[PDB]
Structure 1
Amino acid sequence: MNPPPPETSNPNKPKRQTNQLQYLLRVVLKTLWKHQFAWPFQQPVDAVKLNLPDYYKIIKTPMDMGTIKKRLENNYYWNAQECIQDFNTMFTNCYIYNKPGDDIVLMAEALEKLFLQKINELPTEE
């Protein structure tokens, strides 16, 4: 069985639009989403279909770009750091579960390189 996905809606949660969060959607997410290696990361890991009964025994804070995209589009976040953390959780989970040189790790590394290049130009909050 898969767990429920991370939440993307929560009326109780304080949230904002900031220029940094707008950059995270329009520049960061858009750049990674269109990449040829984005597809494994565009939705929660389906441990049933991938036949990974241990995945959610090991990965206790799952995250994926489909969730991040919905969070950004639904203005779920309060600040850029919350969203940056989600991207880092996604990459770290892949490295925790998999092994160096696996195809999925090479894919995550390519996306992470672009992520770092784009967040290096995150605008000053204004």
Structure 2
Amino acid sequence: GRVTNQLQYLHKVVMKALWKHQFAWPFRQPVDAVKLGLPDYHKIIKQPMDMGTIKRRLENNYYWAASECMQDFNTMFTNCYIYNKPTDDIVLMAQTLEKIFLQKVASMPQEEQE
């Protein structure tokens, strides 16, 4: 439970940008294995992660440090590459979003404090 300048950056600059991205829509809520006909999803992916959960954790001061938050973003993208076929459009969508994620993280303010 903390508010830091980096977590505020992650909430208000990084997530705001990814959230509104045209490829973001499959990532804004937990993967719905029932809706999508993916009965194997939870057998392969043991730690589901999505932006909605990350955003809410940012708003409830769940994270102690930015790195904890960056790890959740990473799990979300990693689940997608691991579960899906290489040829699935979702993979290209994740890669596009994760490039922004890394770009924005490179500009994160570096007095880790509050």
* Shorter-normalised TM range: over 0.9
Partner amino acid, structure 2, of 1:120? A
RMSD of aligned alpha carbons = 0.7
Cα shift at 1:75: 1.1
Q: Using the alignment, how far apart are the partners of 2:45 and 2:87 within structure 1? A: 19
* 2:40 is equivalent to residue 51 of structure 1: no
Partner of 1:106: 92
State how many pairs are aligned.
Answer: 112
Instruction: Establish whether residue 121 from structure 1 lines up as the match of residue 112 from structure 2.
Output: no
Q: How much does 1:31 deviate?
A: 0.6
Identity of aligned residues (%): 79
State the match for 1:77 in structure 2: 63
Unaligned runs of 5+ in 2: none
- Displacement of 1:99: 2.0
The whole-number CA distance in structure 2 between the counterparts of 1:66 and 1:94 is 15
User: Are positions 1:93 and 2:79 aligned together?
Assistant: yes
The residue type equivalent to 2:63 in the other structure is Y
> What's the TM-score once normalised by structure 1's chain length?
0.87
1:15-40 residue CA offsets vs partner (Å, 9 max, x unmatched): 10000000000111001000000000
The one-letter amino acid of 2:93's match is: M
Q: 1:37 aligns with which of 23, 40, 43?
A: 23
Instruction: Report the Cα distance in structure 1 between the residues aligned to 2:87 and 2:4, rounded to whole angstroms.
Output: 37
For residues 67-112 of structure 1, the C-alpha deviation after alignment (integer angstroms, 9 at most, x for no partner) is 0010011111100011000000000000000122310001001100
Gaps of 5+ in 1: 1-14
Q: Which one-letter code corresponds to 2:95 in the other structure? A: E
TM-score of the pair, normalised by structure 2: 0.96
CA distance, structure 2, for counterparts of residue 91 and residue 48 of structure 1: 20
